Design an enzyme around this catalytic site. Sequence first.
Site, PDB file in Angstrom:
ATOM      1  N   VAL A  15       0.856  -1.182   0.000  1.00 35.02           N
ATOM      2  CA  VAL A  15       0.000   0.000   0.000  1.00 35.02           C
ATOM      3  C   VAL A  15       0.893   1.233   0.000  1.00 35.02           C
ATOM      4  O   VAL A  15       1.787   1.359   0.845  1.00 35.02           O
ATOM      5  CB  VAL A  15      -0.969   0.033   1.198  1.00 35.02           C
ATOM      6  CG1 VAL A  15      -1.871   1.269   1.124  1.00 35.02           C
ATOM      7  CG2 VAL A  15      -1.796  -1.245   1.242  1.00 35.02           C
ATOM      8  N   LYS A  28      -3.214   0.409  -3.310  1.00 37.18           N
ATOM      9  CA  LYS A  28      -2.838  -0.968  -3.023  1.00 37.18           C
ATOM     10  C   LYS A  28      -2.450  -1.659  -4.322  1.00 37.18           C
ATOM     11  O   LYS A  28      -3.182  -1.592  -5.315  1.00 37.18           O
ATOM     12  CB  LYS A  28      -3.981  -1.733  -2.355  1.00 37.18           C
ATOM     13  CG  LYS A  28      -3.646  -3.193  -2.028  1.00 37.18           C
ATOM     14  CD  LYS A  28      -4.779  -3.822  -1.216  1.00 37.18           C
ATOM     15  CE  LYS A  28      -4.294  -4.732  -0.100  1.00 37.18           C
ATOM     16  NZ  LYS A  28      -5.416  -5.035   0.845  1.00 37.18           N
ATOM     17  N   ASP A 119     -12.691  -6.823  12.582  1.00 34.58           N
ATOM     18  CA  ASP A 119     -11.577  -6.180  13.271  1.00 34.58           C
ATOM     19  C   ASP A 119     -11.884  -4.697  13.503  1.00 34.58           C
ATOM     20  O   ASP A 119     -11.066  -3.814  13.237  1.00 34.58           O
ATOM     21  CB  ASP A 119     -10.279  -6.365  12.480  1.00 34.58           C
ATOM     22  CG  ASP A 119      -9.041  -6.078  13.311  1.00 34.58           C
ATOM     23  OD1 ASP A 119      -9.117  -6.129  14.556  1.00 34.58           O
ATOM     24  OD2 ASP A 119      -7.980  -5.800  12.704  1.00 34.58           O
TER      25      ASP A 119
END
Length: 241
Positions: A15, A28, A119
Amino acid sequence: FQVLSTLSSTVNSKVYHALRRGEHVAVKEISIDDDAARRRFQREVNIVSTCNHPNIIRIKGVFFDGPFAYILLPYYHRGSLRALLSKQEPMSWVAVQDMLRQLASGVAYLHEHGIVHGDLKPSNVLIADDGRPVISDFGIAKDHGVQYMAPEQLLKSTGMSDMWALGFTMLEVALENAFFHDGSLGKPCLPLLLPEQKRIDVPAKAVGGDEKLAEAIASVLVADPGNRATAYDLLAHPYFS
């Protein structure tokens, strides 16, 4: 585009911080020569491109050069909610409510479209230029953006385990802000769920005196995932409604 720096590096992924025509962007880069990699890429891009919500990271574009794919993502100069907490500056409690409502609205949207984030945490909640929260670090945006693990995960990821993580995100924001407003509360520590504990107790005093905020947080920090508020439940709580 002109590359400034490498924001992260894994195997089979980089990235970059870039300047694509006067504008800052995250790029990315992956290789999709192999069919298995190409199909994984399609799934991960589609998880994000499925979403059309102001509080969920948006893809700006995808383009190909030989075997390489480049995914253009926003670059947010204001950083993450983690960076904001690290400034240790008091935040308006009205703005906190508005930020947390938008975050909960984003999570509800993900779950309504069958996406488990997996997450959620302050580091993965980005702050747009206009100050709104933007959920990142899922699907192809993985790597663009502990008490946080749901009890059942200590024995996969579900909508329920997301709600636990969102609860601790909310709690860390509230404990820290209360401290920033009132230093006599003491430096806060995030609680841990002990064996044979029903729920995390959240005293109104620790989150600045707002009983509705404490109750909203407590509704998702229930040990039994079947007794945990859903994202829609949480948005219906008086703190948000």
